[PDB]
Amino acid sequence: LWRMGDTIADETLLRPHKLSNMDAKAYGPIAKTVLQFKNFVIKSINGRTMRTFYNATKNNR
């Protein structure tokens, strides 16, 4: 049971990059929350501050 849950969740939610690659019948109460948090992260990385910091020193930790 645990293996099934983990595999399905990982493959469906975390693998496909880009927002035009997601296909799904319907979404539940936690799928929306995960998607919106991921959207927040993706917005954060594309900014100017993070790009300048990474260019100056190649420190991703």
Added chain:
Amino acid sequence: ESWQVGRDIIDTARKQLIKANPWVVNSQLSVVESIFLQDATGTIRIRYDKELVGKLYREQ
């Protein structure tokens, strides 16, 4: 001194794109350099060029 038409076209296009689509407000619609109109998440992407703009302007 004809660089004063592309400026107006770009401004008008940006205003229309913001007006017609009601989820861009939280995003940051920008202009990178061809010329692209991009989104914060990188989903909306449009391209512009000299020749088509000139031809359409002349015809109009």
